Design a protein around this ligand. Structure first.
Ligand SMILES: C[C@@H](O)[C@H](N)C(=O)N[C@H]1[C@@H](O)[C@H](n2cnc3c(N)ncnc32)O[C@@H]1CO
Ligand SMILES: C[C@@H](O)[C@H](N)C(=O)N[C@H]1[C@@H](O)[C@H](n2cnc3c(N)ncnc32)O[C@@H]1CO
Lengths: 145, 143
């Protein structure tokens, strides 16, 4: 799994078209979404992650949470961003892992938002540009490294 | 080298303060910048790139140019983005490679912009969200 964390003044997205044959079911009101003063977590679930979804998800939850604490971000946004990596996990597994991370961040106490899975999405972001406002994290099963 | 390509309506940046002891010298006008209808190339020069700056630079220019062609963009913006990777190349080397890529793209005939090297920078971007609007590239020179 590759994660790109961006501490932002806001994140806004717009669904444009389906990117998969069967994307995550959503309502019309979800075709556009937005969150303020947020740590945006762009995530690409990799093939290697398929070896242990739970382990990877738990590690992602920990790493994202640690950065949110550091920058004092009360809001976190899980953004499916497949093309952050070249070797992708199959969609069904990617969705599963992203759901687990969302659930975990929620359980940690953060106000969590997310963008629909399986779509081509336009987005607008404004990175605060502070010391820890741009960070990347590589998370893989312990057996895979 | 790790490259994140974002086809965008615009890219705007604001230099905060230096993030290294000796950043690229800049004039007041270079502290801010904007480009529209542009393929933004966020680049992190990796330690592995130090082995062959010329090779990695040439491949990067080729890959970026190919994507620009695919998305039909004429504007390209080189954005130093160290945090796309964990194993960073030495700054002197990073700056040289970013400049080589910047110039290589200009040589292809593109309208190219670049943000200053060595600073903490705030930025705003708006991704088109069409197919190929978001692509990444891992360029590693074996020789
Ligand atoms: C396309 C671009 O604008 C948009 N932002 C997009 O990336 N869409 C992805 C994710 O929503 C999801 N998806 C599929 N596989 C994965 C994966 N391995 N990891 C994360 N997401 C995935 O399905 C879409 C196509 O890959
Ligand atoms: C900080 C963040 O907001 C800003 N956007 C930033 O990344 N600033 C980087 C690059 O401009 C440059 N830099 C240093 N090493 C590298 C490298 N290996 N590759 C690319 N750039 C580098 O030096 C600055 C501090 O690392």
């Amino acid at each position: 799994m590759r994660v790109l964390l961006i501490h932002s003044d806001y994140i806004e997205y717009e669904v444009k078209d389906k990117a998969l044959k069967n994307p995550e079911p959503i309502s019309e009101d979800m075709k556009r979404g937005r969150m303020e003063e947020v740590l945006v977590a762009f995530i690409s679930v990799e093939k290697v992650d398929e070896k242990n979804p739970e382990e990877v998800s738990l590690k992602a939850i920990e790493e994202i949470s640690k950065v949110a604490e550091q920058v004092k971000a009360e809001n976190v946004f899980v953004y499916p961003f497949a093309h952050l990596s070249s070797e992708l996990a199959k969609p069904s597994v990617a969705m599963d892992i992203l759901n687990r991370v969302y659930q975990g961040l929620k359980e940690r106490g953060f106000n969590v938002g997310k963008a629909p899975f399986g779509y081509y999405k336009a987005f607008k972001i404004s990175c605060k540009g502070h010391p820890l406002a741009e960070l990347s994290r590589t998370i893989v099963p312990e057996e895979a490294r």
